[PDB]
């Protein structure tokens, strides 16, 4: 198991067309009335998207400016960073026309995330609070997975992109990394936020893992239980 988890003499798997039924299941779940704002989601000048054309009596500027996407950080992430990012990019109209389009956007961000966190939890047996952190710590992005629908993954040819077919294979080994030992999300959240601050070396911003981490994170996972006071001190 330890050699497999360290990635030496790796596993073999079959690309069964059941995988297309799962990705077509994601595309179906995306398509049936979720009406998602993912239409060319991030990249600058977000033009020609339906939602703010209807609400144009309250604010017109659907194209915005720079990107509408997030990287996690410790202690406080959330919609305050999404607000500060759109507030920083040269909007002089600091009145309610700027704040209302944040409270219009929060449920539209949830409608992108909630699909994966509610569905893949029933494929692989992990809690919905772990899924987006597991996905990024594996070396992936929620939109990059959702874009494979636009790359015609739902087509039942017996071939799909490596970006899915090897990602899916890689997810099972990283699932054993979180079940051959059990740990809580705040550890993953710190490890994903700031590796050198946790105590790692700069190359471990990459997806790669080796024994000098595995000793230290395991002996931490003992010490956090062995200590004479509760979790958070």
């Amino acid at each position: 198991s330890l050699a497999l988890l360290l990635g030496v003499t790796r596993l073999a798997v079959v690309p069964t067309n059941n995988m297309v039924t799962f990705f077509k299941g994601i595309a179906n779940g995306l398509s049936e009335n979720v009406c998602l704002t993912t239409d060319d989601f991030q990249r600058q000048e977000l033009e020609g998207a339906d939602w703010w054309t209807l609400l144009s009596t309250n604010q017109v500027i659907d194209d915005m400016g720079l990107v509408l996407d997030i990287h996690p950080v410790w202690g406080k992430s959330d919609e305050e960073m999404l607000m500060e990012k759109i507030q920083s990019i040269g909007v002089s109209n600091d009145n309610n026309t700027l704040s209302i389009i944040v409270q219009i956007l929060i449920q539209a961000k949830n409608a992108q995330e909630n699909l994966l966190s509610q569905t893949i939890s029933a494929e692989y047996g992990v809690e919905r609070s772990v899924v987006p952190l597991q996905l990024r710590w594996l070396g992936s992005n929620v939109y990059s997975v959702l874009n494979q629908v636009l790359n015609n993954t739902p087509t039942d040819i017996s071939s799909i992109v490596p970006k899915l077919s090897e990602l899916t294979y890689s997810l099972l080994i990283y699932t054993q990394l979180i079940n051959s030992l059990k740990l809580n999300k705040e550890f993953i959240f710190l490890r994903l936020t700031q590796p050198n601050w946790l105590g790692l070396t700069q190359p471990k911003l990459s997806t790669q893992l080796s024994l000098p981490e595995i000793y230290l994170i395991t002996c931490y996972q003992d010490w956090v239980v062995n200590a004479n006071k509760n979790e958070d001190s």
Binding site: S56, Q59, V60, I61, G65, I89, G90, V91, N93
Partner: protein, 158 residues
């Protein structure tokens, strides 16, 4: 609240020089208005506050039951979308509403409704400080016998 009813004649409002000048305004332009205090307030008992409830129009003109009074009324209007900083259509209906005449009598000013509806009546909940227009449109192609225009208003004071 203090519900009040009011009426005015354009001949009585403007004086005889404007029914004379109307020989241009029959064809070239709208007729331009504002309900300023010297007729709406100073000629009546005083008030702290004022909000509209209904309006209507009658047209002193030589028009029979067999013919159409295709004129138009408006309050200065918009249908336009607000744009912030970062670094209309062919006689369509603007959401503020603009009443089109048919009879040349007060039922050209509102249709079907008595004293209730699911929705606010023309100018309901506005102050009287606005500006207004009368335009004949295609009625100007047979306009030959107009004499005066009569307006009616319902509003609440306090």
């Amino acid at each position: 609240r203090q519900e009040i009813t009011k009426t005015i004649s354009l001949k009585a409002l403007l004086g005889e020089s404007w029914p004379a000048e109307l020989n241009k305004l029959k064809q070239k332009t709208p007729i331009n208005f504002n309900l300023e205090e010297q007729i709406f307030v100073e000629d009546y008992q005083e008030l702290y506050q004022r909000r509209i409830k209904s309006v209507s129009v009658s047209l002193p003109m030589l028009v029979g039951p067999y013919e159409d009074v295709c004129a138009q009324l408006t309050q200065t209007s918009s249908s336009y979308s607000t744009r912030a900083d970062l670094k209309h259509l062919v006689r369509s209906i603007q959401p503020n509403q603009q009443i089109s005449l048919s009879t040349g009598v007060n039922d050209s000013g509102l249709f079907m409704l008595n004293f209730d509806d699911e929705r606010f009546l023309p100018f309901e909940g506005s102050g009287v400080d606005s500006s207004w227009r009368l335009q004949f449109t295609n009625l100007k192609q047979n306009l030959d016998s107009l004499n005066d225009v009569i307006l009616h208003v319902k509003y609440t004071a306090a």
